[PDB]
């Protein structure tokens, strides 16, 4: 299999002019300075950019590129996108269960894994965890071996590496490339780009393309690249790396001067006479949701210190509120206490949902490369990770608050009023978490969104009803009291709990209330805050929250759907 | 001047064994892998580590190292520690104002700087801003040119660069090193270390020391370093970097095998016969506090988007609280609103002072390198930057919250109560800021301290008196209500504001209160919260916060004083 590209004018600003060449099965290479097209000609030939900038044609063996080009070729990201909490056996099963056909047996699927991991020489680390901040794992020299094998699953004809040596040691990098040249003799074409190689690296290549500042400066065999620049009018001294010598000519021991020398080359015409010789989903839905939710759940178990910690904080802050507010008294101070803790329990659900920004932001570079390669659909990605991360880690702490503080404080001692409180803190937990997915989706930085979640809640906190009284806001602001998540929770806990209570000892007020301005029953507190007494007035909040969940997750759906994928 | 070191055994685990060599005036370089001693031999010879680990001697021209060695030598950090928001003219005046004595004239000191900046060739950027993220500044190839001149102010004989090429471009670094060889012929003994140089770099050296894994593996003239290893048993091919060839030996084309080869050298024996021939504050306190506070004040004005922003945040949020709580009524809802806004103001002062963690953490490596260089005292650093950054950026928002909302809300319209509220928000802003310096100072990460500031406030917030009633906590938790900064401000604001008020319209209650459980006056709200009515009870809160400033800044001082400076 060979590539052949011709007359590409890529723009966003044309940062490419006209680049020509074939790529034989061997060791194709792209060298140059980081400002040039060493990372942009690669993404064009790997179909990773916008096709609107594309001008020329990219042909395979006489055939132009189909839409099956991505599923028939492997691209490997510069940094590792591997699941550092899964083992290499687990990741290669995950890649196999989403890319290969469903007709294959697991006994067929395991052997295809077993050939690859032996081809990578990874039998000694075959069940070792890869490595996280909190788990000692396999060294960085074989994380790169893992990621290449993730794209060796389909056994493609064409491989795309992006900087396979940047980030490793020099003794590490030769071990990677010697493995690659052994792949090159098997018939798999390898296309990569190295930042500043060594002569021990450069002695192994089979074809070289030297790019700088959007101009093709060399194309041909890498052995004849040094002798070309000897015949170009330069001299390479003794004991010098030729790859350093190639970038030495770039910076002046000028760009358009050196390109025109390449125009009059015998290597250019041989490329020119060759390019005219040639010129003239897979898997169903429910299967995708099974393996994706399986993956993120082991990620949730495999990183305990981000998930156990939210349980421990919930228990400890559960007990302290249980200790401070120990059994509440039906006296004049009872209204201040009961409306205090219910304001603390609702707002605790909101501000602890700022950690849900971490959900799609850290997974973003993994989300993009898996979707362009097409392991799943976006609708299948979204319903899985909601089921795996968001759904259990919010059901748990809302029960832990509910089990601890309810009978220590001594709230309304009925059957349903225990469960209505439990259900309410569950709903307000999702709604604040859904707003986090509404904002944090698509962005790549954490601190801008983590700021912005803090901004939105402290305005929602004002209108909740404890700081300001919601009946006496000026009328051109009292429509903002509908846009706040914590109001609907805090109203529901107030409606659940202040019904049959009394707060003036010695004074039966629920038949007649002489001497008013008194607030001697729960209703007179509950009306003065502007809250309905009907049983609809309870459940009006829950349908108000549930509508906010569906809207915010839809916004969370579409922002992943319309993202700049290229 | 010459260095000479002999028989160094440094420990923390002995990651150095026995290293011997002199460093003549010329260009002294240290190569090797990053795990070896290329970063730790430099810190020993520049007196930057603990002398409790050091064993061998360091001699200079026949004399051991005095206490004046940290002031008569220049050490240059790897990354830039320069004030990126100032200019190069102002930075070199800052280094001159704290190292040269007070005898010299400003005419004398500026000519010395003109000697430097003409020698560095920075005439075209002599009055240009250096560079931040928010300011387009001088290029990274000349920030390094700026920082080296900061140590050239005393015109020292001995220079210590730490990786002067790492981070620059390859064509960028040749401009730096050719300057250094032009510095070398002035007679300045230049000592540094390079992560993997180039042969265009390596041809400029004068003396070379190869270290790996705590063992001296070569030390001599850099010209013969290639010729020594051909006699060792290794062959260097043509078109190969000699510097990369040296680390190729380290990784095996073993450590103790190659080390004893160097002990039996003809070069080690010439070195061994050389050592035995040789062997056998500055400025007043008031002057320092000017220039430290002067530099950081320009840093405050030179970064608008971190300082002008908090003015904008103050005014905008100040208008919103002015809009929601527009003029407060003296009715039954009036108590809930007035205690609502006053709770929002005191916690807005506390929770926004988490930004003070940025103060001592970002400037930490500049603080450490300067104090070893001894530009100032730790007493002088700490009193200056508080006078420069913390003092004005907390006086401003407490006035703007005071000026805007006090007449939109229509609080108690007397002369003093405007200023008692103004003073109260200022102290609680300092008290929370002092706690932030009490935690942040000494740590190097932002996020761990920022999370710990977040946990400390939400427990202080419960005890403030709005959520729980303070007089009904059980008595074995009620001792905790004194540790809480938002209690003291909020207690003071409630005392400033509920004194001469009434809240049952039509009902004079201040002579007699019939029909109790009423809260018909400001005292009855104020006593039921557990707050004194005597004018001591107000100011008790201010002398409480004034003590918490003095305690926390002291803890902040001692953590800076007892820091591991090495």
């Amino acid at each position, epitope marked *: 299999a060979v590539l052949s590209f011709h007359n590409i004018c890529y723009r966003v600003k044309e940062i490419l002019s006209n680049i020509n060449g074939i790529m034989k099965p061997g060791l194709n290479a792209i060298l140059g300075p980081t400002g040039g097209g060493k990372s942009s000609l690669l993404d064009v030939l790997a179909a990773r950019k916008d096709p609107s900038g594309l001008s020329g044609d990219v042909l395979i063996n006489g055939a132009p590129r189909p839409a099956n080009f991505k599923c028939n070729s492997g691209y490997v990201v510069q940094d590792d996108v591997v699941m550092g909490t899964l083992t290499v056996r687990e990741n290669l099963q995950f890649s196999a269960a989403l890319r290969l056909a469903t007709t294959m047996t697991n006994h067929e699927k395991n052997e295809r894994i077993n050939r690859v991991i032996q081809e990578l020489g990874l039998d000694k680390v075959a069940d070792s965890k890869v490595g996280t901040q909190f788990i000692r794992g396999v060294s960085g020299g074989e994380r790169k071996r893992t990621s290449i094998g993730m794209e060796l699953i389909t056994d493609p004809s064409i491989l795309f590496l992006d900087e396979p040596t940047t980030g490793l040691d020099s003794s590490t990098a030769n071990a990677v490339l010697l493995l690659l040249k052994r792949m090159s003799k098997q018939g798999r074409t390898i296309i990569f780009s190295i930042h500043q190689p060594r002569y021990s690296i450069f002695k192994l290549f089979d074809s070289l393309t030297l790019l700088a500042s959007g101009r093709l400066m060399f194309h041909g065999p890498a052995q004849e690249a040094l002798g070309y620049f000897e015949s170009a009018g330069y001299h390479c001294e003794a004991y010098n790396n030729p790859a350093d010598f190639f970038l030495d000519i770039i910076n002046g021991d000028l760009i358009e001067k050196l390109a025109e020398i390449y125009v009059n080359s015998s290597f250019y015409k041989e490329t020119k006479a060759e390019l005219h010789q040639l010129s003239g989903y897979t898997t169903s839905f429910c299967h995708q949701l099974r393996w994706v939710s399986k993956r993120s759940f082991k990620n949730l178990l495999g990183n305990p210190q981000a998930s156990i910690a939210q349980i421990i904080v919930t228990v400890v802050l559960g007990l302290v509120i249980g200790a401070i507010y120990f059994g509440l008294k039906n006296d004049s101070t009872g209204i201040q206490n009961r409306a205090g803790v219910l304001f603390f329990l609702t707002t605790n659900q909101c501000f602890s949902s700022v950690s849900a920004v971490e959900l799609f932001v850290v997974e973003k570079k993994l989300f993009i490369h898996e979707y362009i390669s097409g392991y799943y659909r976006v609708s299948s990605y979204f319903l899985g990770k909601l089921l795996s991360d968001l759904l259990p880690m919010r059901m748990l702490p809302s029960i832990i608050f509910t089990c601890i503080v309810y009978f220590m404080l001594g709230l309304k001692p009925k059957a349903d009023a225990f469960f209505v409180m439990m259900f309410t803190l569950m709903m307000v937990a999702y709604s604040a978490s859904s707003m986090a997915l509404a904002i944090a989706a698509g962005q790549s930085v954490v601190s801008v969104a983590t700021l912005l979640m803090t901004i939105c809640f402290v305005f929602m906190m004002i209108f909740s009803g404890l700081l300001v009284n919601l009946t006496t806001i000026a009328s051109w602001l009292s429509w903002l009291q509908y846009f706040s998540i914590p109001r609907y929770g805090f109203t529901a806990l107030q409606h659940n709990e202040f019904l049959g209570q009394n707060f003036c000892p010695g004074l039966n007020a629920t038949g007649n*209330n002489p001497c008013n301005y008194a607030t001697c029953t729960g209703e007179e507190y509950l009306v003065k805050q502007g809250i309905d007494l009907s049983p609809w007035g309870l459940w009006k909040n829950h349908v108000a929250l549930a509508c906010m969940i569906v809207i915010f997750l839809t916004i969370a759906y579409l922002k992943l759907l319309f993202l700049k994928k290229y | 001047a010459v260095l000479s070191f002999h028989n160094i055994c440094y420990r923390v685990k002995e990651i150095l064994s026995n290293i011997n060599g002199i460093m003549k005036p010329g260009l002294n370089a240290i190569l090797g892998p990053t795990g070896g001693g290329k970063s730790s031999l430099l810190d020993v010879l520049a007196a930057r580590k603990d002398p409790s680990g050091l064993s061998g001697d360091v001699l200079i021209n026949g004399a051991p190292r005095p206490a004046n060695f940290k002031c008569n030598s220049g050490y240059v950090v790897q990354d830039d520690v320069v004030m990126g928001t100032l200019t190069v003219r102002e930075n070199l005046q800052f280094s001159a104002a704290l190292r040269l004595a007070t005898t010299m004239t400003n005419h004398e000191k500026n000519e010395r700087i003109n000697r430097v900046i003409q020698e560095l060739g920075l005439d075209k950027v002599a009055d240009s801003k250096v560079g931040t993220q928010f300011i387009r500044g001088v290029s990274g190839g000349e920030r390094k040119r700026t920082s080296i001149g900061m140590e050239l102010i005393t015109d020292p004989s001995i220079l210590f660069l730490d990786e002067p090429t790492t981070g620059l471009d390859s064509s960028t670094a040749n401009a730096v090193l050719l300057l250094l060889k032009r510095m070398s012929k002035q007679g300045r003994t230049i000592i540094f270390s390079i992560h993997q140089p180039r042969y265009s770099i390596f041809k400029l050296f004068d003396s070379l020391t190869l270290l790996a894994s705590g063992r001296l593996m070569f030390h001599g003239p850099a010209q013969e370093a290639l010729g020594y290893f051909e006699s060792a048993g290794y062959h260097c091919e043509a078109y190969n970097n000699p510097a990369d060839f040296f680390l190729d030996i380290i990784n095996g084309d073993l450590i103790e095998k190659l080390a004893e080869i160097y002990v039996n050298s003809s070069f080690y024996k010439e070195t061994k016969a050389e050592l035995h021939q040789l062997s056998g504050y500055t400025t007043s306190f008031c002057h320092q506090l000017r220039w430290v506070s002067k530099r950081s004040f320009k840093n405050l004005l030179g970064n608008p988007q971190a300082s002008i922003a908090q003015i904008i945040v103050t005014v905008v949020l100040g208008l919103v609280i002015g809009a929601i709580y527009f003029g407060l*009524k003296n009715d039954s809802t009036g108590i809930q609103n007035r205690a609502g806004v006053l709770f929002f103001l005191t916690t807005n002062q506390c929770f926004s002072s988490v930004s003070a963690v940025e103060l001592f953490v970002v400037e930490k490596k500049l603080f450490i390198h300067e104090y070893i260089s001894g530009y100032y005292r730790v007493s002088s650093y700490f009193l200056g930057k508080l006078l420069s950054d913390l003092l004005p950026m907390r006086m401003l928002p407490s006035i703007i919250f005071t000026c805007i909302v006090y007449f939109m809300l229509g609080l108690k319209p007397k002369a003093d109560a405007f200023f008692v509220m103004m003073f109260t928000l200022m102290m609680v802003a300092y008290s929370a800021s002092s706690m932030a310096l009490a935690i942040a100072a000494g740590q190097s990460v932002v996020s761990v301290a920022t999370l710990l500031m977040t946990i400390c406030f939400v427990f202080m917030m419960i005890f403030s008196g709005l959520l729980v009633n303070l007089t009904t906590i059980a008595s074995w938790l009620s001792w905790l209500q004194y540790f809480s900064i938002p209690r003291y401000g909020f207690t003071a604001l409630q005392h400033n504001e509920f004194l001469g008020q009434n809240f049952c319209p039509g*009902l004079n209650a201040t002579g007699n209160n019939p029909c109790n459980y009423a809260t018909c006056t400001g005292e009855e709200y104020l006593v039921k919260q557990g707050i004194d009515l005597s004018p001591w009870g107000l100011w008790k809160n201010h002398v409480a916060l004034a003590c918490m400033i003095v305690i926390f800044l002291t803890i902040a001082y001692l953590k800076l004083l007892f820091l591991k400076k090495y």
Partner: antibody
Amino acid sequence: VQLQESGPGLVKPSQSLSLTCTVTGFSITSDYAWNWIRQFPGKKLEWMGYINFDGGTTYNPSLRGRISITRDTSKNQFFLQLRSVTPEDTATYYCATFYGAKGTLDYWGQGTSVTVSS
Amino acid sequence: DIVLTQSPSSFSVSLGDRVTISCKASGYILNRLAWYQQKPGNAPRLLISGATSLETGFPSRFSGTGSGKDYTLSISSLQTEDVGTYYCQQYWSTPWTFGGGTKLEIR
């Protein structure tokens, strides 16, 4: 306990309106709130606004800016001052008394009638 | 605000008859309701405070039994001097609206 209105029984349109209720038998700075109630023909009563015992006041938001209530504590009087009058509110005006802790309009004036024509 | 409603805007009763006047609110009042009796040519005089209690100066033929939103007033065996006009008042919020008022008659 004992209230009595007094004022002009006729006024030009768009000029002014002034009434005066002189409380005897009690001191108006002592206990109560004091308020004004008007009653249109085709009887629909309508509350206007009160002044507190300590000079504070609260007005009906239907009558924005048109009404202001002041008092003279020297002789137990409190004044209704209604401006920019329309010929629609040719009502019967009352000064009344609000206990606060009982919550009802306990005492009511004799009542005067104001007509706005030309 | 809180608007009030006396949907029986009139009656036509006989002497000694038990009549009942309903007053409907546009919100919760929580027994903060009143009743006034206006003869033709006088000021309104308070009849019932707090929707249950009664004022000194009236016989115990008047009684109010209110709960939640539906407040009512019952006159059992009305005399001749009970003809007139009746009003209901909320004093929960600040713009103290009254009811539209009803006017008893004799056939």
